[PDB]
Amino acid sequence: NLPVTVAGLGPMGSALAAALLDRGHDVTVWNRSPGKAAPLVAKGARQADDIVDAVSASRLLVVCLADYDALYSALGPAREALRGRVVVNLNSGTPKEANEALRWAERHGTGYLDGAIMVPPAMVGHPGSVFLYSGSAEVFEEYKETLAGLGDPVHLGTEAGLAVLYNTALLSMMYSSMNGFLHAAALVGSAGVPAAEFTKLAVDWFLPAVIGQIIKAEAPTIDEGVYPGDAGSLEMNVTTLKHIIGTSQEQGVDTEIPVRNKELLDRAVAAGFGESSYYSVIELWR
């Protein structure tokens, strides 16, 4: 029930304020532009038009600005009032913007934690919601119980840009994995298998038990950095991808996904990694 201020009332910011209201917090809401407060006010929020008033209402300042906006600007007029308060910033654009924001907050005597929301607005405050945080451990520990009302809180580290970096990484992985699933679905779909049927083997079993297990079994090899190909080489996987391409062609299914995959391996072979293990390809990318 502590007081909280939510600065930024777009879709995510409004969901945050609503979830805090539903946990019994005294929520004050601010937005630069008018018209977004009414549904929250109907649920018990207090509107504050002036950022200085909004910041002054609460020690905990949950900030979810629009992508174009910046913390230093939105909260600049409240610079004096910020001393002794805490910012949890949930919409940094890049790791460098999060690191700049932490420095700005420190200058003003404000605690800072950066966080990445790992679910859409409709799932904030519900089971499965996870928020990844980076920045002050003190803030994290002081407000963990409050933050746990929004989603399971995970503290990654003290470097402010880590949460944006993890989110970027996880989302990159998501898009690649989803595109792989869609090619797979197209392939079984050419024999009449519905996608929802296919998920029984593809998601309930293959994804965790094969894909996930293989990644866990291979991750220490990446960190070691040698990639011996004794027990299976990058070259051999090129052959598998050629077979996938040919099967896709015989089924009348577009080959872009496997072709782009094979291209990547061909580049590693041309860079000398053909007798190394598959995961050596990461070394092209850093």
Place this chain on the structure above:
Amino acid sequence: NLPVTVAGLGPMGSALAAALLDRGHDVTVWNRSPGKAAPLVAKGARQADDIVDAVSASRLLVVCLADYDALYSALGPAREALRGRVVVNLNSGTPKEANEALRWAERHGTGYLDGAIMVPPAMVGHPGSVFLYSGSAEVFEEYKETLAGLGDPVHLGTEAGLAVLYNTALLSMMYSSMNGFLHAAALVGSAGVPAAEFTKLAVDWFLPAVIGQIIKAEAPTIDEGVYPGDAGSLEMNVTTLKHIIGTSQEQGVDTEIPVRNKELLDRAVAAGFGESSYYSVIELWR
């Protein structure tokens, strides 16, 4: 303990024969070329140089030929002896080759089941081993208990090419997912996070709870085929991928993976799918 013949003694074929020997079967082994039988003979296999003799030793014929070889040719000289026997073929190259093989077997009065082995040779006969099968339900049911010694047996359907199709699809998904993980790992690795550390969030949580859940939640939408973008559009995901690209560039991490992902979405936008949901992209591929 029933008798079984294994035809083809490459790495996989030898693992199959060894696993059957370890379950107490009387295993007869054949290969076109000499030199591969000795380690199996040391474990109790019987060598048969003549395919007619090998086929005659057992009703259950487990066939794992080399990629270049074909069932009709390897087992052609045993055409008469094949009547009343059963072929479980574990190395068809394409769905059409499996469907040809089933027809060939039928002509000779042989039962036929095609199967795809979903683990490497070293894991055959061990927990986690899964084999996907397509073809005769009668064969599947007659020999399920024997086959379960090699891996959990799954019958997909009566069409002989389904197991090769499922395997192709699942492997396509695997390569895309692994490449996504490797880009993610490179990204967190640019801030010093080891890959093995990263798997704690990426594989133990994100992969099943986010990626998998999203695929299951979206699969019926693919089958419906309309892809309303009301609650989130293909275009909006283009913006997310632009942010991923920019973050990757700021971290000094190669942008090929996210760029290729964004390219795919740009094509769907140019085909008119921008206001549709993300998964509409599958429709470009079939």
